[PDB]
């Protein structure tokens, strides 16, 4: 039930350990353009939120 674009849900991420490699087996992933940190060098960082 992904929300409509005019009312987009914003899910906050609390404290955890995040590995951005299990994502690739969740969706077809047509486009993965990432405008900040490089997608490949992403498991090696810790985020404020």
């Amino acid at each position: 039930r992904f929300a409509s674009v005019y009312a987009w849900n914003r899910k906050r991420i609390s404290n955890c350990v995040a590995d951005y490699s299990v994502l690739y087996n969740f969706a077809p992933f047509f486009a993965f353009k990432c405008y900040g940190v490089s997608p490949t060098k992403l498991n090696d960082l810790c985020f404020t939120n």
Binding site: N25, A27, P28, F29, F30
Partner: protein
């Protein structure tokens, strides 16, 4: 792990056949070349080579 595959699976997990062609474009006696008909050699006379 294996790659059992069926048409039922969706986009992104479909097998992409990929071939990379790697060439060492460097100073050496060339082996593979393009389709250009070589001309005669001219000496002691300003030309484009």
């Amino acid at each position: 792990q294996s790659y059992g595959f069926r048409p039922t699976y969706g986009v992104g997990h479909q097998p992409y056949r990929v071939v990379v062609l790697s060439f060492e474009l460097l100073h050496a006696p060339a082996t593979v070349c393009g389709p250009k008909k070589s001309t005669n050699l001219v000496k002691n006379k300003c030309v484009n080579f």
